[PDB]
């Protein structure tokens, strides 16, 4: 079944062209979404460096307070191959946008638990000298 295999396998490459096309658009959302996520985190760090300071002051203030069939076929596949150019524009950028953030997230979790502790201590030392 020559024509039955050169067309079915081709019929898939066609249902394949859109596939990577559909996944490319779906990937674009990952681009715009991972871009939005990167932004919404720039403010998180901002609020993380904001708490870091205030706490240091507060703590100190408390001490101071305590004391043509194949021609098209190829074109359809070529489009699938060209999409890699877009598939590349994704995995890369965001892929790295992942490291920068994660390494930043950890620094956010730590200080997040750090301030928490200094709050428990400050409260304890404060209770003993309350009204």
């Amino acid at each position: 079944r020559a024509d039955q295999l050169a067309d079915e396998s081709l019929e898939s490459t066609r249902r394949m062209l859109q596939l990577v096309e559909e996944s490319k658009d779906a990937g674009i959302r990952t681009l715009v979404m991972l871009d939005e996520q990167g932004e919404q985190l720039d403010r998180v760090e901002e609020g993380m460096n904001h708490i870091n300071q205030d706490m240091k002051e507060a703590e100190k203030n408390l001490k101071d307070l305590g004391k043509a069939r194949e021609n098209e076929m190829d074109e359809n596949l070529e489009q699938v191959s060209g999409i890699i150019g877009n598939l590349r524009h994704m995995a890369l950028d965001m892929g790295n946008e992942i490291d920068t953030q994660n390494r930043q997230i950890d620094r956010i979790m730590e200080k997040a638990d750090s301030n928490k502790t200094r709050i428990d201590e400050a409260n304890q030392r404060a209770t003993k000298m309350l009204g």
Binding site: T13, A58, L62, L65, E70, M73, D74, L77, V80, S81, I84, L87, M90, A91, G95, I98, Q101, N102, I105, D106, I108, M109, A112, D113, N115, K116, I119, D120, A122, N123, A126, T127, M129, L130, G131
Partner: protein, 61 residues
């Protein structure tokens, strides 16, 4: 066989990056969830800090 083998692995190579994408994207999911349990647990104490900092206000101010 020309264009065939040509377009053959052309994708087998794109099958790798996703293997990296699916993973690097899932590793984040768990890390963020970890921050969700600490960041909140933090403000949870802030509710105490505010009240505690206020009690100190009625003693030295």
């Amino acid at each position: 066989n020309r264009r065939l083998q040509q377009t053959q692995a052309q994708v087998d190579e794109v099958v790798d990056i996703m293997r990296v994408n699916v993973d690097k994207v899932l590793e984040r999911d768990q890390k963020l969830s970890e921050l969700d349990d600490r960041a909140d647990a933090l403000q949870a104490g802030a509710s105490q800090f505010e009240t505690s900092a206020a009690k100190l206000k009625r003693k030295y101010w």
